[PDB]
Write a protein that binds this DNA or RNA. Structure first.
Ligand SMILES: [Zn+2]
Ligand SMILES: [Zn+2]
Ligand SMILES: [Zn+2]
Ligand SMILES: [Zn+2]
Ligand SMILES: [Zn+2]
Length: 147
DNA sequence: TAGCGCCCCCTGCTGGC
DNA sequence: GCCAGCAGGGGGCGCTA
């Protein structure tokens, strides 16, 4: 924000409250992660990130879809899932204007369709070049009996 | 501080084409 | 094989009480 009073003494960012600067410095500069999982080595800057992480250990899925049986561990994942029902495609490739349901899909599109000289994968068993690593995985399972 | 969201990242698979 | 759809784990910030 323009007049944000709390300037970071280590980068160009500034914040409206000192609490926001404190948290930003923990994330980006000092890396103090006060909140520690008791079941693995995970630790986080914010407690809410620990709580979300714990749901991966327990399987808790608090956020139920009202149109199907899906339920998520994170409110945003449910909002992302609702795009499968609405057909919303919020992301647009600035180069060719194709639209996508997720931002990562769009980034991958730009890598595969609008980027010069991208390194490709190669099947060693049949001498086929494959663009995406996951499609090399599929090829190995489908054509070379990877179990 | 904890707590609510908003949103992006990276990963890696699926099935239509 | 190419492609966009689509979910899991996670980082970082906006904002408030
Ligand atoms: Zn900073
Ligand atoms: Zn853990
Ligand atoms: Zn649903
Ligand atoms: Zn494009
Ligand atoms: Zn092969």
């Amino acid at each position: 924000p323009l007049g944000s009073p709390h300037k970071c003494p280590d980068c160009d960012m500034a914040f409206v409250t000192s609490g926001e600067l404190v948290r930003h410095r923990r994330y980006k500069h000092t890396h103090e992660k006060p909140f520690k999982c008791s079941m693995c080595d995970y630790a986080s800057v914010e407690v809410s990130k620990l709580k979300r992480h714990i749901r991966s250990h327990t399987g808790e899925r608090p956020f139920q879809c009202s149109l199907c049986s899906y339920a998520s561990r994170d409110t945003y994942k449910l909002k992302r899932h609702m795009r499968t029902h609405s057909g919303e495609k919020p992301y647009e490739c600035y180069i060719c204007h194709a639209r996508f349901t997720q931002s990562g899909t769009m980034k991958m599109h730009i890598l595969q369709k609008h980027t010069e000289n991208v390194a490709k994968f190669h099947c060693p068993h049949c001498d086929t070049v494959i663009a995406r690593k996951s499609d090399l995985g599929v090829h190995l399972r489908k054509q070379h009996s990877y179990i």
